[PDB]
Amino acid sequence: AAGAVILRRFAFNAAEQLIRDINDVASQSPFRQMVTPGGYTMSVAMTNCGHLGWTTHRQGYLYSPIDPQTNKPWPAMPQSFHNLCQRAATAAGYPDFQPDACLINRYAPGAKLSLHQDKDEPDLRAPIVSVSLGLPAIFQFGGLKRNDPLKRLLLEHGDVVVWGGESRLFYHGIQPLKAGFHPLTIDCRYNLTFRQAGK
Ligand SMILES: O=C(O)CNC(=O)c1ncccc1O
Ligand SMILES: [Fe+3]
Numbered sequence: 644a645a646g647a648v649i650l651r652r653f654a655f656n657a658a659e660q661l662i663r664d665i666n667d668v669a670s671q672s673p674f675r676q677m678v679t680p681g682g683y684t685m686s687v688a689m690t691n692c693g694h695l696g697w698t699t700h701r702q703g704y705l706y707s708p709i710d711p712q713t714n715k716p717w718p719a720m721p722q723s724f725h726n727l728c729q730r731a732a733t734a735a736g737y738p739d740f741q742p743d744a745c746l747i748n749r750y751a752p753g754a755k756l757s758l759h760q761d762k763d764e765p766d767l768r769a770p771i772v773s774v775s776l777g778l779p780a781i782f783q784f785g786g787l788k789r790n791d792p793l794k795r796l797l798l799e800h801g802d803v804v805v806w807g808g809e810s811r812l813f814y815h816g817i818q819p820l821k822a823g824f825h826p827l828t829i830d831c832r833y834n835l836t837f838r839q840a841g842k
Pocket of ligand 1: 756761771772773782806817833834
């Protein structure tokens with residue numbers, strides 16, 4: 644899509660370390676399946692690291708310094724996360740990107756992410772950096788309207804997408820995860836999305 648940059652296998656050499664750091668983050672702020680304000684439990688399990696974390700609070704979504712499950716700050720952003728995000732963001736031409744939030748998604752087979760926009764960040768000029776690890780997933784994206792036609796791209800282990808420019812506000816999602824196996828993740832896919840969430 645216009646504005647979006649795909650860097651295939653950009654995070655391949657870093658994957659092992661990133662996965663260790665995911666485990667470390669989740670040991671402090673555990674993965675949970677958040678409940679939408681619609682009352683549905685998501686198939687995707689989530690957690691956050693960094694100064695701010697995306698979560699549900701009082702039947703709604705927000706960036707918060709505190710993990711509502713633990714009542715403690717989200718774990719600090721791992722070095723591996725920060726390094727890889729910056730190498731990706733710079734390669735795609737976003738030198739001033741300074742992320743302070745990393746949402747971590749975990750997909751078991753069957754798990755999917757419904758069509759949505761990321762429009763909750765203060766500056767929409769800032770991109771989102773997205774890192775795929777483990778099992779491959781079909782990423783779908785449309786446009787500015789919920790009913791716009793979808794295009795599909797397979798995202799694989801180590802792929803990084805820098806989601807900026809025109810595509811920044813496009814609706815997008817993930818199709819039900821095909822069952823499979825990966826040496827590093829076992830039977831799941833992880834996705835990291837780095838954001839400038841602070842005002
Ligand atoms: O790949 C996922 O599991 C979900 N990714 C996203 O929701 C996303 N959002 C904004 C920009 C890039 C993304 O990959
Ligand atoms: Fe998204």
